[PDB]
Amino acid sequence: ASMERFLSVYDEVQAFLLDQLQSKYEIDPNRARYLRIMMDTTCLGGKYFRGMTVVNVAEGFLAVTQHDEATKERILHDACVGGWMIEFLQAHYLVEDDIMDGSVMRRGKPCWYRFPGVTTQCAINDGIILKSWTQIMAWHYFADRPFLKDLLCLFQKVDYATAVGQMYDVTSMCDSNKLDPEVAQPMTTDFAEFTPAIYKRIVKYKTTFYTYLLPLVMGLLVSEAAASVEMNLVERVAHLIGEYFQVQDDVMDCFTPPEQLGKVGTDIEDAKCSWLAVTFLGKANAAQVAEFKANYGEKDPAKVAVVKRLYSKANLQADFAAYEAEVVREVESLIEQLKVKSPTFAESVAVVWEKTHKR
Amino acid sequence: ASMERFLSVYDEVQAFLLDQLQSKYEIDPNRARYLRIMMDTTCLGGKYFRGMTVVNVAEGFLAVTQHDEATKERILHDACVGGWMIEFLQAHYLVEDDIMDGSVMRRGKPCWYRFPGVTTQCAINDGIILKSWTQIMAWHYFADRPFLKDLLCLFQKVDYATAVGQMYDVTSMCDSNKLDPEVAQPMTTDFAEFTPAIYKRIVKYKTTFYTYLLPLVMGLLVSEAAASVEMNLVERVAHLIGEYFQVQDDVMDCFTPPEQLGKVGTDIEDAKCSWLAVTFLGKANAAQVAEFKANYGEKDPAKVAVVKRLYSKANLQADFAAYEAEVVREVESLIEQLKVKSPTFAESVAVVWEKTHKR
Ligand SMILES: [Zn+2]
Ligand SMILES: [Zn+2]
Ligand SMILES: [Zn+2]
Ligand SMILES: [Zn+2]
């Protein structure tokens, strides 16, 4: 099974990385144990959606391409290693973002930096190591692969887009004209930058490149199948599915219970440019806008409750259903376009969409 | 002149990175200005020793190798770009280490995260971007170069060694047998791990790979001159010069005035495994060891003054002069060995040593 193979490769990559630290980096057993626990705590426990997408894409191509059995195993092992590069990249982001945001919980457990024997002093460097491990994996497992350069160059571009998206995300509540390293950043009072286009820019860079584009293209690269798809369609369909995925997450941060969500949602307190805030501002009357301005971006629970009450009374379920119906049309249109060059890849995209649409 | 060329390339790399953010990453002018100021503040103001080493190594080879003028300019431009990759890598380290350590000053100015309009929330991601910029430079400027893969693989290995060295450094005051993510880390009471071999391990990984090995090998790679030197000698001479460089820094942290140093030294308060602490423990009597244990790793200025008094009374200048005389013998021995295959490269190493020995 796909999952069973994916998790087995985790054991092999972990053993490789820790054994190399022993043989080449003069690590002592206690520090190797610290790093093993750090890797398990930060990389495991999620659904592995991103990593599994590489595996699923590669499985789609194996079903229709002639290969020796040893080659089928090599491609699947490459898809698992590539999937783990993305999961470790995500682990790097989550560790650093939780420190950046002062987050309390992640995957129902404390954020890594909050573990007693970790602290921010270690955790920032642990997050750096998680990303360095992605490059050590690539150079070791893909040393002789024809796709090595394309995969490293794609991974680098996606990682950079993600860091730019993090900048767009954490500065989304400030007025662009007031950004200045020398001056403490006040929260916007006009919310003029809470628009659908600005929100789409945040999401495109902060989430879509590493969550959808990267696993899909990595699946194509380990399959030596990129010159079989129209890359502009892959980009357009990744950015559409990714935006939809983030809109679902934005809704959950506010309305999904803390136990089911795994963390207490703070987008309102943090004054984030969320789908709820943008969509609310896209339909509110003057009085509702004024009430939103007087309560948004404050830690005070009474003001948070006012914002949640404005969202609930604003019937945002109607806007969400209208957005969803539109995304369904556009995603189906793009899947259809993907069938011209590759019905196999289009089917993999259909599965990725189905898995996103239902969660 | 070498410096004039190096700084001119900074302008070109900066323009390239910011223009690409505009044309490909949908950046707005205010965020591009934030990032320009972040790049200038974190990358400029130092001596550019690491970056200049790549340039100097490449200049050494140009003096003895036949090339068209356009090729000489291309090699020098490649050496400057490669030098800037190392300076930006250092900038990434300094930004994250200052956050990790809660440092106040850097290069006589506040640490980046302390700027009013930055904050840790942005600065951790700014440090990530600085390292991502090193990869964007490499893929853009060296796209068609024969040395691209060797340079990227070397850079990745050095960066990973550095992050491992940071882990060794920040955990150097804890007992290895007590490292555990679940348990808050107490400072050692026995100081059994304050040994010359353990100190050499910290320094080798945290400093020597990125400060000496990387600039020397990058100089060889942009010169297409690696298969002209014995790589085991380059590694041995980089780790010797690097260790000497770090011992000088350790002495300065304690005895160099805060104004000349640029920051208030805190190695004693931080209980760092410094050359002074290891060397002191290598010659102290039982009473002196007991006094050191009762005062080391405490923020209290009276206890700090006791440790400084123990160091001053311990005549560590004698140990330093004996260490220096030994390093002089060994570095000269390695330079001599380097002349068998390349008198040109040995001369570049002699210059690197001279520049380290005098500062
Ligand atoms: Zn965040
Ligand atoms: Zn969220
Ligand atoms: Zn440090
Ligand atoms: Zn120091």
Side-chain angles (χ1 to χ4, degrees), chain B residues 73-339:
Chain B
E73 291 297 312
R74 185 208 85 204
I75 294 171
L76 284 164
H77 192 278
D78 285 358
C80 293
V81 170
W84 282 109
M85 289 177 61
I86 311 176
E87 290 294 325
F88 280 45
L89 180 63
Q90 176 179 48
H92 155 81
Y93 296 146
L94 305 183
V95 165
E96 303 297 358
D97 295 351
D98 287 341
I99 299 165
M100 280 183 269
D101 305 341
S103 302
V104 177
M105 303 295 219
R106 170 70 67 180
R107 292 167 183 170
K109 290 158 84 171
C111 296
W112 178 244
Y113 78 96
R114 291 181 74 253
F115 274 56
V118 177
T119 83
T120 300
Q121 177 165 55
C122 284
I124 297 176
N125 195 63
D126 289 343
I128 287 164
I129 290 171
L130 283 158
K131 190 162 57 196
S132 298
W133 277 339
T134 72
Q135 305 306 286
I136 296 282
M137 263 174 245
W139 284 101
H140 173 74
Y141 292 105
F142 310 145
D144 53 60
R145 296 292 193 273
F147 55 80
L148 175 64
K149 286 186 274 161
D150 284 347
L151 190 154
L152 296 170
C153 186
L154 162 72
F155 199 89
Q156 180 263 137
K157 281 166 176 173
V158 164
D159 177 39
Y160 183 46
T162 309
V164 173
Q166 172 69 357
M167 190 203 178
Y168 290 156
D169 193 47
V170 305
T171 64
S172 65
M173 72 294 304
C174 298
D175 289 343
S176 290
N177 56 309
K178 288 249 195 172
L179 303 163
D180 181 352
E182 288 295 331
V183 174
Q185 297 290 286
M187 172 173 51
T188 184
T189 62
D190 64 22
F191 293 91
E193 296 175 59
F194 274 46
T195 68
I198 288 163
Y199 172 75
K200 284 172 209 178
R201 185 187 68 168
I202 299 161
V203 174
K204 178 182 183 183
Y205 291 88
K206 82 163 179 179
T207 305
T208 80
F209 285 99
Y210 92 91
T211 303
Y212 290 93
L213 184 63
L214 186 56
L216 293 169
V217 182
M218 193 170 289
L220 291 164
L221 293 179
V222 306
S223 297
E224 283 286 316
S228 296
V229 305
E230 192 76 62
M231 209 55 77
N232 290 331
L233 288 182
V234 178
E235 298 165 350
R236 281 158 61 199
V237 80
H239 302 322
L240 192 55
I241 303 169
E243 192 211 353
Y244 180 80
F245 169 83
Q246 188 66 62
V247 167
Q248 291 182 288
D249 182 81
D250 285 4
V251 176
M252 291 189 271
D253 190 274
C254 174
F255 301 102
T256 298
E259 56 268 57
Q260 207 190 283
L261 186 70
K263 160 77 168 147
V264 174
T266 53
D267 289 356
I268 295 171
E269 298 95 301
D270 298 339
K272 303 299 288 297
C273 177
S274 75
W275 179 84
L276 295 164
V278 172
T279 305
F280 171 80
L281 289 173
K283 73 189 297 190
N285 63 25
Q288 289 155 350
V289 170
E291 188 162 30
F292 173 91
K293 285 184 183 171
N295 295 275
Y296 205 70
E298 291 256 347
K299 206 81 198 286
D300 197 313
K303 298 189 179 165
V304 164
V306 164
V307 178
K308 296 212 180 190
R309 209 78 54 88
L310 286 162
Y311 285 173
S312 297
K313 287 176 185 174
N315 185 215
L316 302 172
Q317 301 99 318
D319 304 79
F320 182 79
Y323 170 76
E324 181 183 15
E326 189 49 35
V327 175
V328 163
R329 281 172 60 83
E330 293 173 319
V331 176
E332 281 182 10
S333 192
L334 292 165
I335 291 170
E336 288 293 292
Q337 291 282 19
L338 285 165
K339 288 170 174 181

Side-chain angles (χ1 to χ4, degrees), chain A residues 64-261:
Chain A
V64 302
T65 312
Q66 308 212 279
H67 291 301
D68 272 347
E69 176 66 23
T71 299
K72 304 180 187 183
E73 291 297 312
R74 185 208 85 204
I75 294 171
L76 284 164
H77 192 278
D78 285 358
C80 293
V81 170
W84 282 109
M85 289 177 61
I86 311 176
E87 290 294 325
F88 280 45
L89 180 63
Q90 176 179 48
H92 155 81
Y93 296 146
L94 305 183
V95 165
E96 303 297 358
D97 295 351
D98 287 341
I99 299 165
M100 280 183 269
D101 305 341
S103 302
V104 177
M105 303 295 219
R106 170 70 67 180
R107 292 167 183 170
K109 290 158 84 171
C111 296
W112 178 244
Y113 78 96
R114 291 181 74 253
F115 274 56
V118 177
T119 83
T120 300
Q121 177 165 55
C122 284
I124 297 176
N125 195 63
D126 289 343
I128 287 164
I129 290 171
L130 283 158
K131 190 162 57 196
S132 298
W133 277 339
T134 72
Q135 305 306 286
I136 296 282
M137 263 174 245
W139 284 101
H140 173 74
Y141 292 105
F142 310 145
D144 53 60
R145 296 292 193 273
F147 55 80
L148 175 64
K149 286 186 274 161
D150 284 347
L151 190 154
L152 296 170
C153 186
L154 162 72
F155 199 89
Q156 180 263 137
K157 281 166 176 173
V158 164
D159 177 39
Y160 183 46
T162 309
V164 173
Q166 172 69 357
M167 190 203 178
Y168 290 156
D169 193 47
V170 305
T171 64
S172 65
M173 72 294 304
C174 298
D175 289 343
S176 290
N177 56 309
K178 288 249 195 172
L179 303 163
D180 181 352
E182 288 295 331
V183 174
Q185 297 290 286
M187 172 173 51
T188 184
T189 62
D190 64 22
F191 293 91
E193 296 175 59
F194 274 46
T195 68
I198 288 163
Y199 172 75
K200 284 172 209 178
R201 185 187 68 168
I202 299 161
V203 174
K204 178 182 183 183
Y205 291 88
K206 82 163 179 179
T207 305
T208 80
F209 285 99
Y210 92 91
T211 303
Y212 290 93
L213 184 63
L214 186 56
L216 293 169
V217 182
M218 193 170 289
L220 291 164
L221 293 179
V222 306
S223 297
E224 283 286 316
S228 296
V229 305
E230 192 76 62
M231 209 55 77
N232 290 331
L233 288 182
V234 178
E235 298 165 350
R236 281 158 61 199
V237 80
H239 302 322
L240 192 55
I241 303 169
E243 192 211 353
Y244 180 80
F245 169 83
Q246 188 66 62
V247 167
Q248 291 182 288
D249 182 81
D250 285 4
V251 176
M252 291 189 271
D253 190 274
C254 174
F255 301 102
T256 298
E259 56 268 57
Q260 207 190 283
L261 186 70

